[PDB]
Design a protein around this ligand. Sequence first.
Ligand SMILES: *[C@@H]1O[C@H](CO)[C@@H](O)[C@H](O)[C@H]1NC(C)=O
Ligand SMILES: *[C@@H]1O[C@H](CO)[C@@H](O)[C@H](O)[C@H]1NC(C)=O
Ligand SMILES: *[C@@H]1O[C@H](CO)[C@@H](O)[C@H](O)[C@H]1NC(C)=O
Ligand SMILES: [Ca+2]
Lengths: 108, 147
Amino acid sequence: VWLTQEWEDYRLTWKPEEFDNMKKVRLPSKHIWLPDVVLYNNADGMYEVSFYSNAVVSYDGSIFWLPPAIYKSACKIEVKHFPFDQQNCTMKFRSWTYDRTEIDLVLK
Amino acid sequence: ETRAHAEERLLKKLFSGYNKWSRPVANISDVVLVRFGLSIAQLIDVDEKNQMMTTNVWVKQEWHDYKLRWDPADYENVTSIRIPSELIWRPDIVLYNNADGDFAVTHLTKAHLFHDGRVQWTPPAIYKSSCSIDVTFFPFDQQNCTM
Ligand SMILES: *[C@@H]1O[C@H](CO)[C@@H](O)[C@H](O)[C@H]1NC(C)=O
Ligand SMILES: *[C@@H]1O[C@H](CO)[C@@H](O)[C@H](O)[C@H]1NC(C)=O
Ligand SMILES: *[C@@H]1O[C@H](CO)[C@@H](O)[C@H](O)[C@H]1NC(C)=O
Ligand SMILES: [Ca+2]
C-alpha cells in the first residue's frame, strides 16, 4: 500500500516571491513533525511504513506524504463455503503517539 | 504566547542538565516504583511442536522522574508533553524465558510526561516465549504458558 497522509504545519510557510517563485519543496520526513499513524491489527509486529520517503511541502504550509508500506494484517477467515468463499479482512490505522485530543483522523 | 513557543521553552529547560544514564531518584536510598502491566493484543501462535508461544502485547510502564517536573502556570498551562523515549532514563525490563526473539522492548515509541514527574510509556512488543506443553488430553488440552 501507499499510506497517503496530509496535514498543515503552519511553521513551514514561505513567501514564493522571496524564493524565486518556488511553490513547493521536498523535505525529508525524518526532519519534520509526523503524525505517527500505523496499522494496529498487524501480525508479525510490523507497524511503521517501509521507507520513510520525502514529504512535499507547499508554500502555504500544507504537507503531502506518500510512503510505501508492506503490511501483514490478521483477519478472520470464514471457511464455510471454501473454495467458493469471500473474505472480509480489515485494516485498522491509529496514532500510537497522539489521541483524539491532539490529532483528528479524517478520510480523504 | 502560542503553545508551541511554551513547549519549546519547556523542552529546553527540561533537558538542559538531564543525564539519561542516571537512576532518577533525589535520594540514593530511594527506590524507583515501576507500575507494570500487560495488555494482550493478540495470541499470534501457540507452537506445540516447538513448545513456543508468540504474543503481541503492550507493555505498560509507569514511574516517576524527579528531574522532569515543572509548574504549568509558567508554561502557558502545559500539563503534559510527548517526548521520544530514547531521551530519558527507562527501566530495563526483559523477558527471562525468551526463545527465538528479543529480550527487551525494541520499538521505543514516545513517552507521555506529566508535570508532576510521572512518565507513562506503553511500547508494543512481539514476544516468543518458552512454555512446556502438556498433551495428555489432546485435543481437549488446557495449556499454561508463562511470561
Ligand atoms: C536520604 O535518606 C536517608 C534515609 O533513608 C537520610 O538519612 C539521608 O539524610 C537522605 N539524604 C538526603 C540527601 O536527603
Ligand atoms: C489548564 O489546563 C487544565 C488541564 O488541561 C484545565 O483543566 C484548565 O481549565 C486550564 N486552565 C487553567 C486556568 O487552569
Ligand atoms: C500455571 O503455571 C504457573 C507456573 O508453574 C503456576 O504458578 C500456576 O499455578 C499454573 N496454573 C494452573 C491453572 O495450572
Ligand atoms: Ca499451532
